[PDB]
Amino acid sequence: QPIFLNVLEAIEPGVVCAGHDNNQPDSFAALLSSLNELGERQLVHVVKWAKALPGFRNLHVDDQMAVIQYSWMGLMVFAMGWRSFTNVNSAMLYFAPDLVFNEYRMHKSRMYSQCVRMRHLSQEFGWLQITPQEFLCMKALLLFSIIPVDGLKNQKFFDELRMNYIKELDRIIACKRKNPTSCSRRFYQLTKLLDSVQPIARELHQFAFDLLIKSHMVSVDFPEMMAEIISVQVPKILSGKVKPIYFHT
Amino acid sequence: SAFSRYYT
Ligand SMILES: CC(C)(O)C(=O)Nc1ccc([N+](=O)[O-])c(C(F)(F)F)c1
């Protein structure tokens, strides 16, 4: 009966790996070259995952592309937290298997505060008793959670489609939690969780772009496609031309 | 772009 939820699980990506020299003593330059590799791989995986989404083929192929490029980091950060939650129970950061982040790597990467934030969201998963089905469904909602204020090439469709993903999230909660101030209690937190992802993303958007600019001066390598997105679409978000849709203000 | 042309 869970037609929507079959799909989401059915289309779930594999455990992507970075290919990081775990035998080499840590260094900013080494660390961030694997995280850029990681980004670039996961991006591909996001692309294929996203195209299978129910009603995604509905969007105009530019919107299809745009929502991917805009929402791409937040998705990486969401799933990531679930990975560190379910693999390392939230003690470290399960980026990929070959790239798990301890405290000293967190600091050595120069994204410490930013990771502080992400280990929190990892902790949120447990604290809030997030279900696997609750995760997947929140995860899907996130591709539809960041519009350009400029206007999408076909907004109407996007809006219909988004409004539906919320129904589906409702339905996942309203299922086994039969009660008024329960479904209500839950949704709040979940939307309150989903919103909290955005600040993390924009921070990583700032670090990335920054690193990208000063990359000539650090020995850190941006994949052909990493670096186009970070230059072409990220500055849109950072310049405020693209904003996240928030549940609360 | 590089994304748009890998995408389609
Ligand atoms: C491209 C930038 C600097 O490397 C980056 O933040 N990469 C990156 C790669 C993978 C993952 N991941 O979810 O496993 C993440 C992050 F979502 F955790 F932040 C970032």
CATH of domain A1-249: 1.10.565.10
Resolution (A): 3.3
Q: Which residue has the least CA distance to atom 3 on ligand 1?
A: A208
> Which three-class secondary structure state does DSSP give residue A177?
coil
- State the method: X-ray
Within 8 A by CB and 6+ apart from A174, the residues are: A183
Q: Is the CB of A75 under 6 A from ligand 1?
A: no
A205-240 in b/e burial notation, b at 16+ Cβ within 10 A?
A: bebbbebbeebeeeebebbebbbbbbeebbebbeee
The Cα–Cα gap between A148 and A154 comes to 12
Amino acid identity of residue A117, one-letter, is R
Q: Residue B8's closest chain A neighbor by CA?
A: A61
The Cα–Cα gap between A147 and A243 comes to 6
Q: Which residue has the least CA distance to atom 13 on ligand 1?
A: A76
Q: Is the CB of A234 under 6 A from ligand 1?
A: no
Q: Residue A43's closest chain B neighbor by CA?
A: B3
Using an 8 Å CB-CB cutoff, list chain A residues near B8: 61
Q: Where are the beta strands (DSSP E) in A1-102?
A: 93-96, 99-101
To test the pocket of ligand 1, the residue of A33, A41, A42, A83 to mutate (highest count of ligand atoms within 8 Å of its CB) is: A42
Residue written as tokens 């008793």?
A129
Count CA within 13 A, CB hemisphere, residue A91. Answer: 3
Partner-chain contact A228 B6, CB within 8 Å: no
Among candidates A199, A192, A176, A78, which has minimal Cα distance to A128? A192
Smallest CA–CA separation between A59 and chain B, in Å? Answer: 14
CA angle A116, A122, A125 (to 5 degrees): 145
Q: Residue A40's closest chain B neighbor by CA?
A: B3
The interaxial angle of helices A155-176 and A3-10, nearest 10 deg, is 100
Among candidates A65, A80, A82, which has minimal Cα distance to A143? A65
The Cα–Cα gap between A4 and A165 comes to 9
The Cα–Cα gap between A226 and B6 comes to 13
Looking at the DSSP assignment, which residues form a beta bridge with residue A96? A99
